[PDB]
Design a binder for this molecule. Structure first.
Ligand SMILES: [Zn+2]
Ligand SMILES: [Zn+2]
Ligand SMILES: [Zn+2]
Lengths: 452, 452, 452
């Protein structure tokens, strides 16, 4: 019986039960946390992974808090580099957690973890079977399993190659779905997990999930040193999971959208496979398997199955007062998508679509702040579909006109909505075939020994 | 009592019960798998085949994972070539599965399978009664039964001849129905199994099941180096079963659409017969029987019986922005097809047909992402049927006009829908009478012995 | 079982239960206090913090009344400076409370607190483990935990650095949400807590929560020595919690809106993190963690998650008779915000929106004095949204015009409402990376010893 820190009258509790049928998920709410659904999912995902791999196997745990791996009956060589600000408090809490159980419980190798902690304190560069101060790259502890839990600022092929050359044949990546970033949206929601993200460029928008703006009156033209001339997605993105914030790279998010098959080609070549094994409303687990040698061939295609609807639409907002249009993505519940099928046979207005969506939502099925952007999206889609039906072509025929040369061109129709309905698949041409592949200080090193 | 890993409140569970009446199918859901229906069907199909062939018989298992044939009381010479990326992990899991049962169970010849595996490890080119690294062609183990389970990238007559000259008299082929590829559709759905497939050319469509596109605004003519002038189905196709992807050849898919009778003519001639014995909403089992000698005569006709409706219609979508039309196939539930009979007596609009289909779907009978393409298909069909009734001809009379020569020509009417209703049969002129008919590396060969 | 001094038939009692699920909150009303909800929250917050940190730890308590920390089983070095007017009576009540328990209870170190009180009386400049007359800066008692409970007239980074250089690694700040002051509103409400605040400049308004005006008849122009020409938020603000008043600095309120990560850079550098762990309708607890050294990097972004709606709108009121417009903020219950989703698809009038809000309020969900300003706000927002939809732009395009130079300018649209819906996030660019960092008299010193 897995216990999840969520309210008993929570609708997510049912979806979570559907995502983990091998467990008896029971609500036991201890904290009023604002991203409780996300922690619930990641907790049940670690449970699944443990139940799935064989014991007596050692598990690297990248970017991890050792404290959350302290009462576990499994060899966790927690690779914990002191890079960000989240890490010294993680290490201090791991120390204060071993000390609170040094002479209480003896089914975990508590004293062995204390000894390895003090060994890595006496030597900052050493490697002990349960703890490491190196990065996932510079670590030297061989293992069979690697686990990436909510770690996105990582280049996937470099990190996976560096685990592969250390004997890791199985990696698990738990995190938010990378599909909204393969579509190059400017902003987006993972509404079930209270998560909103935006490009750094649209943080002064008015009506996306993650923004903040001012009252202005519509004054004279604010001067700029730069001409914009083009509002396009840039690398820097901000995620807010509840009220927790993190910056992230689009390049590193996209690196984790891996094809079904890829090849890691260095001094040691590996043939790797990525599958999505858990998928709940935007949050996924990817099981990656690495094998030595070059086997098979790569198409270079990554596929996303859609259990609920995925929308990416064009919205018009004001960023710092200036009215612009950019793309926005969200997840729509499958039952809402099913109940809109009949409405979407006609051209519907965003206002009628909004009142219909509000009727279908009754307790709410989807979050209401995303209903307008969804309504308008459905309205554009139903419109574009009608324009396809009216401008019907001949079967097997393209009306391409010439470029005064050996070149030909065609009209592109305007697409304001990508609507991926429940039970469809997204397929993207991503890269397979990859070839190219000391941060502590004293006052904390002193502090750790003060607890042991 | 066969146990299937599907939710107990699944409608597929009833159709599956209808497809396997000799079993007592019970839902026991362990995984939230996104193609659970497909694995359920293929599992019950292997059960059927085992209950159907006599024991003490040896069974070749083409393209197979030996791990899924390890707890079975039947002689499976699992021919397992290390061709694709799926194979090294299949072999590693077979090794890690024998080791987890080496001294547990003794009703299976566990230790004999261990000895045969490590004999094929000591010799990569040898043949042992339970394991093989050769292809289905280059294998040398004589058998009575062959089994192709989800094995499509094979030329059927070459493979069947190579099993026949080794004494195989009975082959079973489990897989998706090959009828949509005899019709040359560009894209298609097997909706009950969450499966969508597309030609490589239309992967940037917008509103098929397996596609992905961008937001654009309808900009200037994108330049091409090639003139298209013709959008026609090419050999390369992509299947997505849930989120699992595979490339497939149209030629090799079509090779498995076999006629009722065909002749394999080499040094040893065989008279072969193909029948469909299980058929559930797009997924089939073909029982093939091979007999030495030339017997009877071949018509060259393959027949598909339709328990539910089969649609192939012309849709207009945009591929990479360019509006085109191509053919799309799907399966419609028989009860939906039956309830549309009265509507389809009139000319109906796609919009009215869509609202009627949504009414008939209530819990849904068919998946909703296919309702628009089905609605439009039905409306074309009802329209074309009316145009047949108005342009009635004389009985036994063709109005063919002359070509200034000894040739004559006639008008072809436009056909935008092929609708094969429940209890009708498709018949295609296919080929009978066929005449023309070392992949391991060290680091994995080492790894296998590390588990024995 | 935590007991709260609020009426048993109070709706707040349920929200409070949701904010502290680890407790069994029971109403036990002793006082008819006009800010009972606020004291209930701050009481449950102190309980949470005690249950959360380890005992045997010493705990600074900034700006605190020692009397409210007298029956607690935890080392509270209550730093109590005699700065404001409430502090002599706080000290006298702490003395009169120790005297009423000197020979009653012995689980608290009562006589030790009496001895330390008399030690700080014998020496005004000394430091004893339970009492201090210094400011939070000039105190010299090292600790592990600091607690700021309803302490706003403090510069946050200076105070946190001064606790950090004394060994404090964990700080808790309990107080009203600082988000309305990051938005620079002129006046505002925290309605659940009966709290209204205003800029000193609009205290003579007519229809904000915290104002007072006269009857006039609309006489001749009142003369001013100053031209106003601009009504903008100034530093001085007045809060009224029930009937309790305090002046506040906008700068010091804004200093406590801390980013997720910041750096305190002095002689001793620290890497600090701020998270909101409790959040009920405008009242928050921020857990701050300080670590020695410079770790990671700072974005400079502070995020506010919105469980209920946050409005900032422009109102037109009369201040001292003169009709002006300024910004006003408030919190709208999430259920009211959800039930307005369908209404806000159209352009609605403030009058129709007001009658709809009065309908939705039935016992009231929100306080009624804020319904008109909310109604106005909603109607402006729904209007502005329509103007976004009609003036739709091209995707990724800004129409900026030139300034006869290398500069370009754009139109700003008028924004009269910032509406942050339930489950959205505010994100503000605040400062990380901080580098720049005897009040008693005799007649009371005499009085304190008279009680011991
Ligand atoms: Zn390590
Ligand atoms: Zn073989
Ligand atoms: Zn002090």
């Amino acid at each position: 019986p897995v216990y999840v820190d969520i309210d008993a009258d929570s609708a997510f509790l049912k979806a979570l039960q559907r995502a983990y049928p091998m467990f008896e998920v029971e609500p036991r709410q201890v904290t009023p946390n604002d991203h409780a659904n996300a922690r619930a999912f990641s907790h049940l995902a670690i449970k699944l992974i443990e139940q799935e791999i064989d014991p007596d196997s050692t598990i690297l745990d990248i970017g991890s808090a050792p404290a959350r791996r302290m009462m576990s009956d499994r060899k966790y060589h927690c690779v914990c580099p002191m890079r960000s600000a989240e890490d010294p408090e993680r290490l201090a809490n791991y120390a204060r957690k071993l000390a609170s159980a040094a002479g209480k419980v003896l089914d975990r190798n508590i004293s062995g973890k204390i000894g390895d902690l003090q060994a890595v304190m006496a030597v900052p560069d050493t490697e002990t079977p349960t703890f490491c101060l190196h990065t996932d790259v510079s670590c030297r502890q061989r293992a069979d399993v690697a686990i990436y839990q909510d770690v996105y600022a990582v280049h996937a092929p470099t990190s996976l190659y560096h685990q592969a050359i250390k004997g890791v044949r199985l990696a698990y990546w738990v995190g938010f779905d990378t599909t909204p970033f393969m579509y190059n949206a400017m902003a987006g929601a993972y509404p079930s997990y209270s998560t909103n993200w935006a490009d750094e460029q649209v943080l002064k928008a008015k009506n996306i999930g993650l923004c903040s703006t001012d009252l202005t009156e519509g004054r004279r033209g604010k001067l700029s040193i730069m001409r914009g001339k083009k509002l396009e997605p840039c690398d820097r993105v901000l995620f807010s999971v509840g009220s927790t914030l993190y910056p992230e790279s689009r390049k590193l998010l996209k690196s984790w959208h891996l094809p079904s098959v890829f090849h890691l080609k260095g001094k040691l070549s590996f043939t790797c496979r990525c599958d999505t094994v858990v998928s709940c409303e935007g949050y996924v687990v990817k099981r990656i398997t690495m094998s030595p040698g070059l086997y098979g061939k790569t198409t270079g295609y990554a596929v996303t199955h859609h259990a609920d609807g995925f929308l990416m639409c064009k919205t018009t907002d004001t960023v710092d007062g200036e009215r612009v249009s950019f793309s926005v993505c969200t997840y729509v519940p499958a039952t809402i998508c099913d109940q809109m099928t009949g409405i979407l046979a006609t051209e519907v207005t965003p206002e009628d679509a909004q009142k219909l969506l509000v009727g279908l939502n009754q307790t709410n099925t989807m979050k209401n702040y995303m209903i307008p952007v969804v309504a308008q999206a459905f309205s554009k889609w139903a419109k574009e579909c009608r324009k396809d039906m009216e401008d019907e072509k001949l079967l097997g025929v393209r009306e391409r006109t010439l470029t005064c040369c050996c070149l030909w061109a065609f009209k592109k129709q305007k697409t304001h909505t990508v609507y991926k309905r429940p039970d469809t698949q997204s397929i993207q041409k991503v890269q397979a075939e990859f070839d190219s592949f000391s941060g502590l200080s004293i006052p904390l090193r002193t502090r750790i020994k003060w607890l042991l």
